[PDB]
Amino acid sequence: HMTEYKLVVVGAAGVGKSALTIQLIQNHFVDEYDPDSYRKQVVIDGETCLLDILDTADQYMRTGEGFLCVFAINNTKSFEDIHHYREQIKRVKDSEDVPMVLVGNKSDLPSRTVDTKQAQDLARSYGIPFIETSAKTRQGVDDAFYTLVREIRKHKEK
């Protein structure tokens, strides 16, 4: 009675992968978590979905159905590292069409070193959606995860 979607959250250290996941799971913002798998049942477009979410630093990398590729909008390096995460995902999947969303987190912070245009340009080159989030305020969090689910459906029957 529920459709399972296996999601994997990747990106450089400190960008907010756990905070985003915890927002989705607990509806709470964690300032300090310890640098595993989570399950969430949610109805997306009339379908009861069981999300299976791996918050990374492989099994889930080979078996993940879709990826959130997260950088922080005040961490230029994390943005630059997206290329390396995306290449990695493509290698395993032997495909240039893997369900993925580009997420620019920490939108509440004033210190923005990656502009929205840089991010939009990158997502456009990859053929994927770009969503801005804050795990702190919860702006964009559901959007990012729901959009990923929709991208998985777009690529394959579920």
Ligand X SMILES: Nc1nc2c(ncn2[C@@H]2O[C@H](COP(=O)(O)OP(=O)(O)OP(O)(O)=S)[C@@H](O)[C@H]2O)c(=O)[nH]1
Give least dist CB 133 to ligand X, A.
Answer: 6
Residue 30, classified by CB atoms within 10 Å of its CB into exposed (0-12), middle (13-18) or buried (19+), is middle
Q: Report the interface residues with Mg ion, using CB under 5 A.
A: 17-18
Q: Is 57 in the site for ligand X (CB under 6 A)?
A: yes
Give the residue before each break in the chain, using a C-to-N cut-off of over 2.5 angstroms; say none if it is continuous.
35, 57
Query: Using CB under 6 A, which residues numbered 2 to 21 contact ligand X?
Result: 13-19
Q: What is the DSSP string of 36-79?
A: -EEEEEEEETTEEEEEEEEE---HHHHH-SEEEEEEETT-HHHH
154: which 2 tokens?
């777009």
Quick note: the x/- pattern for ligand X over 99-118, rule CB under 6 A, is: ------xx-xx---------
Tokens 């840089």 appear where? 118
Give least dist CB 9 to Mg ion, A.
Answer: 8
Quick note: the x/- pattern for ligand X over 66-95, rule CB under 6 A, is: ------------------------------
For ligand X, the closer of residues 12 and 123 by Cβ is: 12
CB nearest ligand X: which residue?
16
Give least dist CB 156 to ligand X, A.
Answer: 28
117 vs 50: CA distance, rounded Å? 34
Give least dist CB 24 to Mg ion, A.
Answer: 13
Residue of 72, 57, 53, 85 whose CA lies nearest to 149: 53
The residue ranges that bind ligand X (CB under 6 A) are 13-19, 31-33, 35, 57, 105-106, 108-109, 134-136
